[PDB]
Amino acid sequence: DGPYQPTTFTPPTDYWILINSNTNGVVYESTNNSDFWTAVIAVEPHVNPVDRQYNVFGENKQFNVRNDSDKWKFLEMFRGSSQNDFYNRRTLTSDTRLVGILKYGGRIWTFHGETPRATTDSSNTANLNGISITIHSEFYIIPRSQESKCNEYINNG
User: Fold this and answer.
1) What helix, strand, coil percent values describe the chain, rounded to 5?
2) Which of 53, 55, 63, 87 is most buried, by the most CB atoms less than 10 A from its CB?
3) d(Cα 155, Cα 141) in Å, to the nearest integer?
4) Is 147 helix (H, G, I), strand (E, B) or coil?
5) Coil, strand, or helix at residue 138?
6) How far is CA 86 from the centre of its chain?
7) Closest by alpha carbon to 120, among 129, 108, 138, 135?
8) Are the CB atoms for 121 and 113 separated by under 8 Å?
9) Taking Cα atoms as reference points, which of 84, 29, 89 lies closest to residue 58?
10) In this structure, how many other beta carbons lie within 10 angstroms of the beta carbon of residue 117?
11) CB 11 within 8 A of CB 131
12) Cα dist. 107→9, 29, 33, 56 in Å?
């Protein structure tokens, strides 16, 4: 199901959005503008610590990023309110360059840790239905029931 072109939309619940990251910089921005902000930054293999400027949620933010590994690093930058600083809540370390997000059961699910054993983690929100996403790369959509397939793709391509 896809690829779909980069766009902004409100994901329906119960579908994995699988994003084929094709450059460094911002992969997706997701917010409900109340208690949930996540931006994922892609950091290429083998770069020293650098202060890079990223356009996240309509603001230029300076993030210190680094990657000493042969894999891409997809940093989840999270804040729980509009006036809080972003922090690197989770990282996905990946040779596949695939990033996943799911709305299900009052929660946002993503993949974190290091391929080929990246696993799902959940963030709670009081407004799941209000979460929309701006996706910067081509993406695919997999039904939650096919998560076994989604895990496979995240971890093996």
Assistant:
1) 10, 55, 35
2) 63
3) 16
4) helix
5) coil
6) 14
7) 108
8) no
9) 29
10) 8
11) yes
12) 17, 16, 16, 22
* SS3 call for 7: strand
Residue 152, φ and ψ in degrees, nearest 5: -50, -55
- Domain total in the chain: 1
> How far lies 87's CA from each of 8, 20, 62, in Å?
23, 24, 12
Phi/psi for 29 (5° steps) reads -125, 130
Structural domain harbouring 39: 1-157
Which residue type sits at 34? Answer: S
Residue type, 25: G
Neighbours of 142 (CB within 10 A): 19
Method: X-ray
Resolution of the structure, angstroms? 1.7
Tokens standing for 17? 């959005």
